[PDB]
Amino acid sequence: YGQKATSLDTLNTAKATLNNAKAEMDVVQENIKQAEIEVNTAETNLGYTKITS
Amino acid sequence: VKKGDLLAEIDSTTQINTLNTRKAALASYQAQLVARKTAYDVALSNYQRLSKL
């Protein structure tokens, strides 16, 4: 964009459509979490396999 | 009649009219130079950059 032309309208694509990419990846982190979590709790509702004394 | 002196005259008309003609031609050809040069300016500063990038 320092090369005079490349209209801001196509830099702005890149800016906001970088942050959207980045953030749409964060969402899939928090989802990775929630799935790891709810899976450990889904084996911790499987504590009950001897009913330990 | 001292060398190179005032002697005669004819109808110089046809000949000056065509002189004026041929100086109009030119007078437009320079006015082509105007544009057929700035077109190259717009396409020198377009290219010298686009190639660097």
SS3 at position A38: helix
Backbone φ and ψ for A39, nearest 5 degrees, come out as: -80, -40
Q: How many other CB atoms are there within 10 angstroms of residue A6's CB atom?
A: 13
Whether the CB of A3 is below 8 Å from some CB of chain B: the reply is yes
How many whole angstroms separate alpha carbon B40 and alpha carbon B46? 9
Task: With beta carbons less than 8 A apart as the criterion, state whether B32 and B38 touch.
Answer: no
Please judge whether A4 and B49 are an interchain contact, meaning their C-beta atoms are less than 8 angstroms apart: yes
- Resolution limit in angstroms? 3.5
Whether the CB of B41 is below 8 Å from some CB of chain A: the reply is no
- Name the residue type at position B30: Q
Task: With beta carbons less than 8 A apart as the criterion, state whether B52 and A3 touch.
Answer: yes
Q: In this structure, what is the dihedral angle of CA atoms A24, A27, A33, A36, given to the nearest 10 degrees? A: -70
Quick one: which of B14, B48, B53, B27 has its CA closest to A1? B53
Helix, strand, coil % in chain A, rounded to nearest 5: 70, 0, 30
Phi-psi region of A4 (alpha: psi -120 to 50; beta: other; left: phi over 0): left
Please judge whether B52 and A4 are an interchain contact, meaning their C-beta atoms are less than 8 angstroms apart: no
